[PDB]
């Protein structure tokens, strides 16, 4: 299997757990599934890779199923980037 080439959408509000982590529920829109979900957290400038992804190698099984991704953004402003290139879903997050 390879990285998903297509776009992603979010099925529910991003939920902050009691363990200082965030859970994202994603739906794949593109082709080539099953494929690996490209997901990373970037700084305020949308440059350097920050925080971490908790879930092991998240996969999009098809274009109907929902992929549950647990991640840990750093404190303050960050950007959760789901997918590849300019088609990628960018989600602004602020951790208190």
């Amino acid at each position, epitope marked *: 299997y390879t990285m998903c080439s297509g776009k992603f959408s*979010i*099925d529910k509000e991003m939920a902050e757990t009691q363990h200082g982590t965030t859970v994202v529920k994603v*739906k794949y829109e593109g082709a080539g599934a099953p494929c690996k979900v490209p997901i990373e957290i970037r700084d305020v400038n949308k440059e350097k890779v920050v925080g971490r992804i908790i879930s092991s190698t998240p996969f999009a099984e098809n274009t109907n*199923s*929902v992929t549950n991704i647990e991640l840990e953004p750093p404190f303050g402003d960050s950007y959760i980037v789901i997918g590849v290139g300019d088609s990628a*879903l*960018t*989600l*602004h*997050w602020f951790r208190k």
Partner: single-chain antibody, 226 residues
Framework: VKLLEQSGAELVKPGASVRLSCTAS????????MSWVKQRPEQGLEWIGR????????KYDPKFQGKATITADTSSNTAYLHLSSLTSGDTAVYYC?????????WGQGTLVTVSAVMTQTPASLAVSLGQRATISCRAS??????????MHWYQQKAGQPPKLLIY???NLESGIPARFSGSGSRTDFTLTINPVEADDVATYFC?????????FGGGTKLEIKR
């Protein structure tokens, strides 16, 4: 495709109560938002409310509070709509739907017969074949969440459920021709159809979903210039 299976038509007397069902397949409802939408004959789409089946949290449009009760059973992967003290005003097609960034999935609709701000412009328009058509949506407040505009566009052809065209203001839904495009940020949004084709004759609706209520615009009927 058709992942949402709705219960059959209801024909009741006033004062009755009904419980409509929506069974999902190909996904677990726990991981989604399940909404119900009302449509009176020849009228616009009205968001009733939504359930988060994971915790049973429900939110309703102020108009439907006291009339509608949405429930969910994660074990049978079914969402329900309870309507109490039914009146002729409740006669409508009721749709169940899945999604937050627009409703990509709709049920077939359930007809319930009781035998007794989002500003969209224009109300209707006509354009010649091959020409550009533009439909506008103005929200009374900003519709951003996580730096993204939660503004969506739908097409609804006569006697059919609506279908998602554009989600998150400018993203083209899979299976939708590239002649459909969305633009805008802040409070003003536009759906562009260019070039217009004969098969584009339908009613178009905008919808916001950043915060509850997930209000639909009043709709715009598109016709071809005679």
């Amino acid at each position: 495709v058709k992942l949402l299976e709705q219960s059959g038509a209801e024909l009741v007397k006033p004062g009755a109560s009904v419980r409509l069902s929506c069974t999902a397949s190909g996904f677990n409802i726990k991981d989604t938002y399940m909404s119900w939408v009302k449509q009176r004959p020849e009228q616009g789409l009205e968001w009733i409310g939504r359930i988060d089946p994971a915790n049973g949290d429900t939110k309703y449009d102020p108009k439907f509070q006291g009339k509608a009760t949405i429930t969910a059973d994660t074990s049978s992967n079914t969402a329900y709509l309870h309507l109490s003290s039914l009146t002729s005003g409740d006669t409508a097609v009721y749709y169940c739907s899945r999604g937050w960034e627009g409703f990509a999935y709709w049920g077939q609709g359930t007809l319930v017969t009781v035998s007794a701000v989002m500003t969209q412009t224009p109300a209707s328009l006509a354009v010649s074949l091959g020409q550009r058509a533009t439909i506008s949506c103005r929200a009374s407040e900003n519709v951003d969440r996580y730096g993204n505009s939660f503004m969506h566009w739908y097409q609804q052809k006569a006697g059919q459920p609506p279908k998602l065209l554009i989600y998150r203001a400018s993203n083209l839904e899979s299976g939708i021709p590239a002649r459909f495009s969305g633009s805008g940020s802040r409070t003003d949004f536009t759906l562009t159809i260019n070039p217009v084709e004969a098969d584009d004759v339908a009613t178009y609706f905008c919808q916001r979903s950043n915060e509850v209520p997930w209000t639909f615009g009043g709709g715009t009927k598109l016709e071809i210039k005679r």
